[PDB]
Protein backbone atom coordinates (compact mmCIF):
# COMPACT_ATOMS: atom_id res chain seq x y z
CA UNK A 1 0.00 0.00 0.00
CA UNK A 2 2.68 2.45 1.00
CA UNK A 3 5.42 0.93 -1.20
CA UNK A 4 4.38 1.34 -4.79
CA UNK A 5 2.39 4.42 -5.49
CA UNK A 6 -0.61 5.45 -7.53
CA UNK A 7 -1.58 8.95 -8.49
CA UNK A 8 -4.84 8.07 -10.07
CA UNK A 9 -6.78 5.61 -7.97
CA UNK A 10 -10.46 4.90 -8.53
CA UNK A 11 -12.52 2.97 -6.06
CA UNK A 12 -16.06 1.80 -6.00
CA UNK A 13 -17.92 3.29 -3.06
CA UNK A 14 -18.66 -0.04 -1.43
CA UNK A 15 -17.36 -1.34 1.85
CA UNK A 16 -14.82 -2.57 1.21
CA UNK A 17 -14.04 -0.52 -1.84
CA UNK A 18 -12.73 -2.09 -4.99
CA UNK A 19 -9.90 0.11 -6.11
CA UNK A 20 -7.60 0.23 -9.02
CA UNK A 21 -4.77 2.38 -10.09
CA UNK A 22 -5.21 3.78 -13.56
CA UNK A 23 -1.77 5.40 -13.76
CA UNK A 24 0.00 4.74 -16.93
CA UNK A 25 3.64 4.17 -16.50
CA UNK A 26 6.28 3.76 -19.06
CA UNK A 27 7.66 0.27 -19.66
CA UNK A 28 6.55 -1.34 -16.48
CA UNK A 29 3.93 -1.27 -13.91
CA UNK A 30 4.54 -0.44 -10.32
CA UNK A 31 6.45 -2.83 -8.11
CA UNK A 32 3.31 -4.33 -6.56
CA UNK A 33 1.33 -4.83 -9.74
CA UNK A 34 0.35 -8.44 -10.27
CA UNK A 35 -1.38 -7.85 -13.55
CA UNK A 36 0.43 -5.53 -15.94
CA UNK A 37 -0.26 -4.90 -19.63
CA UNK A 38 1.56 -2.58 -21.86
CA UNK A 39 1.31 -1.21 -25.31
CA UNK A 40 4.01 -2.53 -27.56
CA UNK A 41 5.37 0.93 -28.25
CA UNK A 42 8.40 2.79 -27.19
CA UNK A 43 7.83 3.84 -24.57
CA UNK A 44 5.38 1.10 -23.60
CA UNK A 45 2.29 2.45 -21.91
CA UNK A 46 1.79 0.07 -19.02
CA UNK A 47 -1.28 -0.29 -16.91
CA UNK A 48 -1.76 -2.29 -13.74
CA UNK A 49 -5.14 -3.97 -13.78
CA UNK A 50 -4.99 -5.06 -10.15
CA UNK A 51 -8.00 -4.50 -8.01
CA UNK A 52 -7.38 -4.01 -4.34
CA UNK A 53 -9.43 -2.80 -1.47
CA UNK A 54 -7.16 0.20 -1.03
CA UNK A 55 -5.28 2.77 -3.01
CA UNK A 56 -1.52 2.77 -3.01
CA UNK A 57 -0.13 5.93 -1.59
CA UNK A 58 -0.07 8.85 -4.03
CA UNK A 59 3.10 9.14 -6.05
CA UNK A 60 2.96 12.98 -5.90
CA UNK A 61 2.74 14.88 -2.58
Amino acid sequence: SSKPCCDRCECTKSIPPQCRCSDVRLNSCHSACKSCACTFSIPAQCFCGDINDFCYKPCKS
Binding site: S22, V24, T39, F40, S41, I42, P43, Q45, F47
Partner: protein, 131 residues
Protein backbone atom coordinates in the same frame (compact mmCIF):
# COMPACT_ATOMS: atom_id res chain seq x y z
CA UNK B 1 8.78 -9.59 -32.04
CA UNK B 2 9.91 -12.24 -29.62
CA UNK B 3 10.59 -15.62 -31.27
CA UNK B 4 9.97 -14.42 -34.73
CA UNK B 5 12.56 -14.59 -37.43
CA UNK B 6 14.24 -12.13 -39.64
CA UNK B 7 12.09 -11.24 -42.65
CA UNK B 8 13.25 -11.55 -46.25
CA UNK B 9 14.41 -7.96 -46.86
CA UNK B 10 11.72 -5.89 -48.54
CA UNK B 11 9.18 -8.71 -48.27
CA UNK B 12 6.77 -6.66 -46.09
CA UNK B 13 6.91 -3.52 -48.17
CA UNK B 14 4.16 -1.76 -46.40
CA UNK B 15 5.92 -2.02 -43.06
CA UNK B 16 7.16 1.36 -42.07
CA UNK B 17 9.20 2.46 -39.11
CA UNK B 18 7.97 5.48 -37.19
CA UNK B 19 11.01 7.38 -36.13
CA UNK B 20 11.69 10.55 -34.25
CA UNK B 21 13.65 13.30 -35.91
CA UNK B 22 16.90 11.48 -35.00
CA UNK B 23 16.02 8.17 -36.58
CA UNK B 24 14.96 6.49 -33.41
CA UNK B 25 12.37 3.92 -34.13
CA UNK B 26 9.46 3.92 -31.68
CA UNK B 27 6.62 2.16 -33.53
CA UNK B 28 5.77 0.59 -36.81
CA UNK B 29 3.10 1.47 -39.31
CA UNK B 30 1.75 0.16 -42.50
CA UNK B 31 1.47 2.00 -45.79
CA UNK B 32 -2.07 1.67 -47.07
CA UNK B 33 -1.27 3.75 -50.09
CA UNK B 34 1.33 6.27 -51.28
CA UNK B 35 0.14 9.00 -48.97
CA UNK B 36 -1.14 7.29 -45.90
CA UNK B 37 0.20 5.13 -43.18
CA UNK B 38 -1.88 3.44 -40.60
CA UNK B 39 -0.35 3.02 -37.19
CA UNK B 40 -1.46 2.65 -33.56
CA UNK B 41 -3.00 5.69 -31.90
CA UNK B 42 -1.12 4.99 -28.66
CA UNK B 43 2.20 5.42 -30.52
CA UNK B 44 1.76 9.17 -30.16
CA UNK B 45 3.01 9.98 -33.64
CA UNK B 46 3.36 13.63 -34.29
CA UNK B 47 4.30 15.61 -37.36
CA UNK B 48 7.84 15.84 -35.86
CA UNK B 49 8.17 12.16 -36.43
CA UNK B 50 8.99 10.52 -39.69
CA UNK B 51 7.73 7.51 -41.57
CA UNK B 52 10.62 5.51 -42.88
CA UNK B 53 9.59 3.13 -45.66
CA UNK B 54 11.66 0.55 -47.36
CA UNK B 55 13.86 -0.39 -44.39
CA UNK B 56 14.96 -3.79 -43.66
CA UNK B 57 18.07 -3.25 -41.60
CA UNK B 58 17.83 -0.18 -39.40
CA UNK B 59 21.54 -0.63 -38.62
CA UNK B 60 22.33 -0.18 -42.28
CA UNK B 61 22.84 3.22 -43.88
CA UNK B 62 22.94 1.75 -47.36
CA UNK B 63 19.33 0.75 -48.07
CA UNK B 64 17.13 2.66 -50.52
CA UNK B 65 14.87 3.98 -47.86
CA UNK B 66 12.35 6.72 -47.91
CA UNK B 67 12.15 9.09 -44.99
CA UNK B 68 8.73 10.56 -45.30
CA UNK B 69 7.53 13.61 -43.50
CA UNK B 70 4.14 13.46 -41.87
CA UNK B 71 1.85 16.28 -42.90
CA UNK B 72 -0.94 15.38 -40.50
CA UNK B 73 -1.82 12.89 -37.85
CA UNK B 74 -5.40 11.69 -37.64
CA UNK B 75 -5.94 10.00 -34.34
CA UNK B 76 -9.20 8.10 -34.26
CA UNK B 77 -11.32 10.26 -31.95
CA UNK B 78 -12.74 7.05 -30.38
CA UNK B 79 -9.25 6.08 -29.22
CA UNK B 80 -9.36 5.44 -25.50
CA UNK B 81 -5.86 5.97 -24.08
CA UNK B 82 -6.66 4.04 -20.97
CA UNK B 83 -8.22 0.97 -22.52
CA UNK B 84 -6.24 1.35 -25.79
CA UNK B 85 -9.48 0.71 -27.69
CA UNK B 86 -9.84 2.07 -31.24
CA UNK B 87 -6.08 2.15 -31.35
CA UNK B 88 -5.55 3.57 -34.74
CA UNK B 89 -4.09 6.69 -36.25
CA UNK B 90 -3.67 7.62 -39.81
CA UNK B 91 -0.58 9.54 -40.90
CA UNK B 92 -0.97 11.58 -44.01
CA UNK B 93 2.42 11.94 -45.58
CA UNK B 94 3.68 15.41 -46.65
CA UNK B 95 5.02 13.71 -49.77
CA UNK B 96 3.81 10.51 -51.42
CA UNK B 97 5.91 7.43 -50.88
CA UNK B 98 7.41 6.20 -54.11
CA UNK B 99 6.19 2.63 -54.41
CA UNK B 100 8.82 0.17 -55.57
CA UNK B 101 9.69 -3.50 -54.89
CA UNK B 102 10.32 -2.69 -51.24
CA UNK B 103 7.67 -0.06 -50.66
CA UNK B 104 4.05 -0.56 -51.35
CA UNK B 105 0.66 -0.89 -49.73
CA UNK B 106 -1.00 -3.46 -47.56
CA UNK B 107 -4.63 -4.21 -48.38
CA UNK B 108 -7.34 -2.95 -46.11
CA UNK B 109 -10.13 -5.30 -45.26
CA UNK B 110 -13.76 -4.47 -45.66
CA UNK B 111 -15.50 -3.84 -42.33
CA UNK B 112 -17.54 -7.05 -42.97
CA UNK B 113 -14.49 -9.26 -43.61
CA UNK B 114 -14.24 -12.40 -41.51
CA UNK B 115 -10.77 -13.33 -40.42
CA UNK B 116 -11.60 -16.43 -38.55
CA UNK B 117 -10.18 -17.37 -35.18
CA UNK B 118 -7.39 -19.84 -35.85
CA UNK B 119 -6.23 -18.18 -39.03
CA UNK B 120 -2.45 -18.06 -39.16
CA UNK B 121 -1.51 -14.43 -39.84
CA UNK B 122 1.74 -12.57 -39.70
CA UNK B 123 2.98 -9.67 -37.76
CA UNK B 124 6.12 -7.81 -38.51
CA UNK B 125 8.15 -5.13 -36.92
CA UNK B 126 11.33 -4.10 -35.29
CA UNK B 127 10.02 -4.53 -31.72
CA UNK B 128 12.17 -6.24 -29.15
CA UNK B 129 13.11 -9.83 -29.93
CA UNK B 130 13.71 -10.55 -26.33
CA UNK B 131 12.07 -8.70 -23.54
Amino acid sequence: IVNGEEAVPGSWPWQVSLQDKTGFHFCGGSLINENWVVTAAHCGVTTSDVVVAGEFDQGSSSEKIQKLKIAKVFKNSKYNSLTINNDITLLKLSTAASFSQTVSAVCLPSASDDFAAGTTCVTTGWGLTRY
